[PDB]
Amino acid sequence: WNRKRISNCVADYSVLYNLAPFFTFKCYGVSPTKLNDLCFTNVYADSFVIRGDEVRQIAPGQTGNIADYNYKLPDDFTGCVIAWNSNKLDSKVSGNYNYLYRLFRKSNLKPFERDISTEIYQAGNKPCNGVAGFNCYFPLKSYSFRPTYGVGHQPYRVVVLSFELLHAPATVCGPKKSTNLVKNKCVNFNFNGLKGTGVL
Amino acid sequence: DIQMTQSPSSLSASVGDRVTITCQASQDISNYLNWYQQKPGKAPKLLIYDASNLETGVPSRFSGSGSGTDFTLTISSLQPEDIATYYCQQYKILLTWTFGQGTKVEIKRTVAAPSVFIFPPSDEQLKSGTASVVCLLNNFYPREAKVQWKVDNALQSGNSQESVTEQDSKDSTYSLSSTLTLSKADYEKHKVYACEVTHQGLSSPVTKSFNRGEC
Amino acid sequence: EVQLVQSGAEVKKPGESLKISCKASGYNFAYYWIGWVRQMPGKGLEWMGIIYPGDSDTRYSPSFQGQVTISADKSISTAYLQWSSLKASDTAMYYCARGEMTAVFGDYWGQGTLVTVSSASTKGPSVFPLAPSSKSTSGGTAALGCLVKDYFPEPVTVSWNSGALTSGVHTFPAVLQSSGLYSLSSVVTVPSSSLGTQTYICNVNHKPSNTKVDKRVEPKSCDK
Amino acid sequence: EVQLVQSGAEVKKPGESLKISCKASGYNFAYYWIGWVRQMPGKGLEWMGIIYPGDSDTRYSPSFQGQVTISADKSISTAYLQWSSLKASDTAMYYCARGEMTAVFGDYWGQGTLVTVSSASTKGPSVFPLAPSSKSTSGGTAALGCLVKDYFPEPVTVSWNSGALTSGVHTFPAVLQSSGLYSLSSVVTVPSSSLGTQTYICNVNHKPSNTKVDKRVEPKSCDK
């Protein structure tokens, strides 16, 4: 799965509404409406594509066929998850085989980790010794996508965000404009999302 | 914004040789390239649709490779049936699309003497009010064919018409038809008219002349 | 088996409107993409827009947003490219192509469509013949042909016999000439043995005004 | 009214592949269920599997899980049976049936297809005539017909006067001979004089050896 780093920019989260009617748009820890009124330090964005029914598995505190070995959200995650249908864009009439899914591995993974090893899964009692065969399976498999399939198997594009919440010099937030500075009077103030009243 | 560059703008070679071409980009774009060929005519054609993957229905004289921003295409053995236009293009945004600039190819052939023919004016042009000196050249190489005119053995320059085609894959030639056009009162006022032809492959430039009385 | 069919050429004047169409068949039309490409002589290619007629959706280039319109009908399996207003710098060739997002584009392309717009008016062509004379080749070959220098706009269609010969026919690219006009010519080669019985009833058809002009030509000489 | 269609019988080598289609028409194909049934001659039957198009739903019998494949196409309304690797234990006949889950599951059926796997080769059948005596026998009207000698394998088609003769015909089913081949005979009864004014001839066609043989029957003399 691919990830991207975003910093030193002015955001505008309303434009996301320009898209088609979504299938999943949820957030944990922050109400999505007022996202424009908070400033952030660094932004990490992950993207990938999942089968239609298994989009539910992108959720904290649950297990599944992907959460076991591929993508593991920490139990204290705060951020937003977006998922929208892609049958219109990622299907060939002849059937497309260019998407890989993990099937077997010894044990689960800690959150925010990756593994692309090609070691053979020793399912059987015999020592495979690096030889493919019976009870020595190839770790990866391929999905299928046809335009006439049902919505239950149509492809879905999913993106995950992540936040940091003002624990450092912030770099990214909305287009709110500044003003001149006044002191020695009783004034209401707002510094980087920290609001207060008093005298400076 | 994304901007491409191609190199070199043009080159020429002969049969049975290796040829190469380079396409460059301002930032890494992760092997989402393809190349298009378009011979003088109508339909551009798809040739290679990935970094090193070729479309079916094309023989195996082509290859190419690249990544990051460095990308090269090459033909191992040139063949005479390859005279066309080439381009490289890219894609990473859903819609931000652009082609490159252009690469020109020309063939090498042994220098050959031109074949020259003359055509006489017709009665219809005499009805229209003009006169033409149709001088036809064909089967010559390279392009250095020059035609001038002499009217009553005088010196003329510039005022004329010409039509030359592209290179012919069979014989490297550029079929040419040139004409000095005058009016009637500029036609019967004088006697002789001559096309002077100069070409490096010729032993010497030759002037072909005719008198008005020969009609 | 996939084929593309287009509407014919067109000439107009600034201040008007125009529409073009592209049609295909031989596959499930609803499950692919259609795109338009502009090409003006002397420059390279440049993308215009795409569409997915299966479910109406449009996208546009940064350099042509809000200038042209794209639509389609899935009942007759056709795509329409429509304008609103015309100006003087939009003379170029237009291409419709069929593509698939995941793997490959441009596996097939249309035959190409032409457009011309200007403030002038079309002028009827004047065809002029020429035939082999007594100055023919000593080996035996000879050449006949036609010349046009009084017509606008282009292209033009020329044939020599009832049908133009399947071989030995040639033409020369048109060049502009200094009356705001253009000119071109075409020729055909023939041996003497075939010339003993062959005559050329040469005809020219021309889109700008559509007046087929035909006349019979046979080899001549300079006799006294 | 509705109609259903299958394909003819096949015989294949070990290790080959195979593909069968069942076609139907008349009703709305998208709102019913299609099922398959196997029969091995001389014994009982057993179910194969069922399919529902539109939703692309498939359901497989216990024994045959993962050893076949069932598909459908709604554009041409067909059911497609696909194997993986043919096996010598598959000589049987297959059907295709229309069914609804709630109330009735045997509305209308098809014709059935024969499949055989063998490593041997076919043998061209031959036919000989059996004729009544020239003089009337004890029965007044005497027997007549034809005999098909050793051949392999099934099936074989026969006709008389292009099928014009079908009343009163009786045929013995083929049985294995000690030579390892198959033989049969088909006979009728006719008067002895009914062979000169008009003709009786049988035609035998063998699909595995795709051959056609003709044999006419004429009165036989009392030879000794």
Residue numbers in the entry:
A (entry chain A): 353 to 552
B (entry chain I): 1 to 215
C (entry chain F), D (entry chain E): 1 to 224
Please give me the paper's original passages concerning this structure.
Like other human coronaviruses, the spike protein of SARS-CoV-2 facilitates the entry of virus into host cells and comprises two subunits, S1 and S2 (11). The receptor binding motif (RBM), a region of the receptor binding domain (RBD) present in the S1 subunit, interacts with the host cell receptor angiotensin-converting enzyme 2 (ACE2), whereas the S2 subunit is involved in the fusion of the viral and host cell membranes. Here, we identified a broad SARS-CoV-2 neutralizing antibody 002-S21F2 that potently neutralizes most SARS-CoV-2 variants, including all Omicron sublineages (BA.1, BA.2, BA.2.12.1, BA.4, and BA.5).
Furthermore, the side chain of K440 in Omicron RBD makes an additional hydrogen bond with D57 in the HC CDR2, explaining why this change has minimal impact on affinity and neutralization. In addition, the G339D mutation in Omicron does not generate any obvious adverse effects in the structure. Structural comparison of the 002-S21F2 epitope with other class 3 mAbs, including the two available therapeutic mAbs effective against Omicron—LY-CoV1404 (bebtelovimab) and S309 (sotrovimab)—shows some similarities between the 002-S21F2 and C135 binding sites. The cryo-EM structures of 002-S21F2 IgG with both WA.1 and Omicron provide a mechanistic rationale for its resilience against Omicron (BA.1, BA.2, BA.2.12.1, BA.4, and BA.5) possibly owing to unique molecular signatures that target a non-ACE2 binding conserved RBD epitope.
